[PDB]
Design a protein around this ligand. Structure first.
Ligand code: HG
Ligand code: ZN
Length: 256
């Protein structure tokens, strides 16, 4: 099955998922001089005071922190979106080295990691129906750079030993996602897709301009996770990022 290796990496995905070469594929390189400042872009509204985390799980390609999305507890609105979007999960993409790890690039600059807060359009009623619409999903992309430790991220780092292999899960309540947001909400936006198979084209991307800093030891813990299940040969969960894809006419707008 699909993965990030030489025999099943991103270059091979198109064979099982033909949309890999579609018209609105993600991630992309954000060219800062070609991006369009759009004065009609409303400021993003992040309402996460009521977020309820439930668990953390190693799904084999990343680790997901899941939230209860049966009510409008943690939502995204404003910016380029129309309607309310509920936070369902968050995950990261990181590299083997500090020089790589992000999926999106800025003027070709690669960051150490990239956080994705996934949300789905409430008029569709469930996440499953959402992935059947062109505006089904909204993903907030936050860049991580290595520097000082991010206090807000440590509870996450500390639970990683418990879900080291694929399929492992752990209760993870009372986690507040607010602790992972940069100071400014200025962003770039474009129409795109999920970055892992099925690569469905239903995502409105909101990429934050300011990165968050994490310490070297924080990122180190991410790299200790395994792609494999318990009892299998160890494969370190590193470089689970997809390369930049062709913009193909699409326009990247800026909120600034
Ligand atoms: Hg879609
Ligand atoms: Zn992602």
């Amino acid at each position: 099955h699909w993965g990030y290796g030489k025999h099943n990496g991103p270059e091979h995905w198109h064979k099982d998922f033909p949309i890999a070469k579609g018209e609105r594929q993600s991630p992309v390189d954000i060219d800062t001089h070609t991006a369009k400042y759009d004065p009609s872009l409303k400021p993003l509204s992040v309402s996460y005071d009521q977020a309820t985390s439930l668990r953390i799980l190693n799904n084999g390609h990343a680790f997901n922190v899941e939230f209860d999305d049966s009510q409008d507890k943690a939502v995204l609105k404003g910016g380029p979106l129309d309607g309310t979007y509920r936070l369902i999960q968050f995950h990261f993409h990181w590299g083997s080295l500090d020089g790589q790890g992000s999926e999106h690039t800025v003027d070709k600059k690669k960051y150490a990691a990239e956080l994705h807060l996934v949300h789905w359009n409430t008029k569709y009623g469930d996440f499953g129906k959402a992935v059947q619409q062109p505006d089904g999903l909204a993903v907030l992309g936050i860049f991580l750079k290595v520097g000082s430790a991010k206090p807000g991220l440590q509870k996450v780092v500390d639970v990683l030993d418990s879900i080291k292999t694929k399929g492992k899960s752990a209760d993870f309540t009372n986690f507040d996602p607010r602790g992972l947001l940069p100071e400014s909400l200025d962003y770039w936006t474009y129409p795109g897709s999920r970055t892992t198979p099925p690569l469905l084209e239903c995502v409105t991307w909101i990429v934050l301009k300011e990165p968050i800093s994490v310490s070297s030891e924080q990122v180190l813990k991410f790299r200790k996770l395994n792609f494999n299940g318990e009892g299998e040969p160890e494969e370190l969960m590193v470089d689970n990022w997809r390369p930049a894809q062709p913009l193909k006419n699409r326009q990247i707008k800026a909120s600034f």
